[PDB]
Design a protein around this ligand. Structure first.
Ligand SMILES: O=C(c1ccc(C(O)(O)C(F)(F)F)s1)N1CCn2c(-c3ccccc3)cnc2C1
Ligand SMILES: [K+]
Ligand SMILES: [K+]
Ligand SMILES: [Zn+2]
Ligand SMILES: [Zn+2]
Length: 402
């Protein structure tokens, strides 16, 4: 069926393409997105999905979010500015490529061309996201997952950072506004790090609700931004929600804490807002397997399928997820699989009874209540009540009844 879940991916985002990359004997190597694409295939999820062809963002598209100067530097191929040669032109190409132990060739990661190819892959990743987003926003597709790299959510107007050159999700949102006049867009960013770029892009805009869940720990975790305080400016006051977790890893945030955060902050506010489209900066660095500096949290991959199913209850299900961070191949492959499975309407493997029974930790509850206190000023859904943040899912269920 063609009104179904869309997928985007492009081999030209990859440094090196190898067949048998995923492997099942000994060797590692082969990156993040190639590994996810391979998992989507051997699970057969790609077969149920409509594979969409991506493209480069135009330089005009990139400038919906970023400066002309930023876009020209990182967006354009650098060899075009050096007036076409032949001997010097051939010399650069011998430095770009390098034969690898498996017989295949790829972009040499131990040369200057690494970050140049990354900036080019970023321009491709943006256009890939925009294509999927528009096919979903238009009803051509129901759903979407963008298997894309590098990430984009830290990339600011005139500043690349955190491996981000261009903010794919923010660009796609700007284009929905300009080209389709979409009245209300919800952007949920569940990468473990604050999406400073996306916040900045829409900070004074009430037409897009930006909601980040991230490790904040009072300003000491990368990128250091995203205080619960930061609620928007001008007409956008109230429409920036930083579900900032504080208290460190005493204990680490897990499934229960994020599920509680959705129950008490994300779904209430998002439902009230009532978006026409939902975009997700879907990093997977919060899942277990991302030690303390990179991540520190231990969500399960299957929690992400449940978080996806939740967001699918908004905007009539007009939702697109785009990969951001996450490193551990198993973790991001398990999470990607759980998310695409959810998007296809497959029955999700139940959460373990342990998770459903578990009350969120005290640091989590305190983090959630600080956010709700701050945002009660802006949302009718947090003015009616008192916090049930410290209840488990089953308790919340039991104590909704009578
Ligand atoms: O935390 C990050 C991240 C940047 C981008 C991250 C992301 O959100 O996962 C993204 F962008 F890939 F999606 S996470 N850092 C901090 C640590 N770091 C380092 C380290 C250097 C020395 C020791 C530990 C880390 C190099 N580059 C970085 C960027
Ligand atoms: K985030
Ligand atoms: K906003
Ligand atoms: Zn290889
Ligand atoms: Zn991250």
């Amino acid at each position: 069926p063609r009104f179904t879940t869309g997928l985007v991916y492009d081999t030209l985002m990859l440094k090196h393409q190898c067949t048998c990359g995923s492997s099942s004997s000994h060797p590692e190597h082969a990156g993040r997105i190639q590994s996810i694409w391979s998992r989507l295939q051997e699970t057969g999820l790609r077969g149920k999905c409509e594979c969409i062809r991506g493209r480069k963002a135009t330089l005009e598209e990139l400038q919906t979010v970023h400066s002309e100067a930023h876009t020209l530097l990182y967006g354009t191929n650098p060899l075009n500015r050096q007036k076409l040669d032949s001997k010097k032109l051939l010399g650069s190409l011998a430095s770009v490529f390098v034969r690898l132990p498996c017989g295949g060739v790829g972009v040499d990661s131990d040369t200057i061309w690494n970050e140049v190819h990354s900036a080019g892959a970023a321009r491709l990743a943006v256009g890939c996201v925009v294509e999927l987003v528009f096919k979903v926003a238009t009803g051509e597709l129901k759903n979407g997952f963008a298997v894309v790299r590098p990430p984009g959510h830290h990339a600011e107007e005139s500043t690349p950072m955190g491996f981000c050159y261009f903010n794919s999700v923010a660009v796609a949102a700007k284009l929905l506004q300009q080209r389709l006049s979409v009245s209300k867009i919800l952007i949920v960013d569940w990468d473990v790090h604050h999406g400073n770029g996306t916040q900045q892009a829409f900070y004074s805009d009430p037409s897009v609700l930006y909601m980040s869940l991230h490790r904040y720990d009072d300003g000491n975790f990368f990128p250091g931004s995203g205080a619960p305080d930061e609620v928007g400016t001008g007409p956008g006051v109230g429409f920036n929600v930083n579900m900032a977790f504080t208290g460190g890893l005493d204990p680490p945030m897990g499934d229960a804490e994020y599920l509680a955060a959705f129950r008490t902050v994300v779904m209430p506010i998002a439902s009230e807002f009532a978006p026409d489209v939902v975009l997700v900066s879907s990093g997977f660095d919060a899942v277990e397997g991302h030690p303390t500096p990179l991540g520190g949290y231990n969500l399960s991959a299957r929690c992400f399928g449940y978080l996806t199913k939740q967001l699918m209850g908004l905007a009539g299900g007009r939702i697109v997820l785009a990969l951001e961070g996450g490193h551990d191949l198993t973790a991001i492959c398990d999470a990607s699989e759980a998310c695409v499975s959810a998007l296809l309407g497959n029955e999700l493997d139940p959460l373990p009874e342990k998770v459903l029974q578990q009350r969120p930790n005290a640091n989590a509850v305190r983090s959630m209540e600080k956010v709700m206190e701050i945002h009660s000023k802006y949302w009718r859904c947090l003015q009616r009540t008192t916090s049930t943040a410290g209840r488990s899912l089953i308790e919340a269920q039991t104590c909704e009844n009578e």
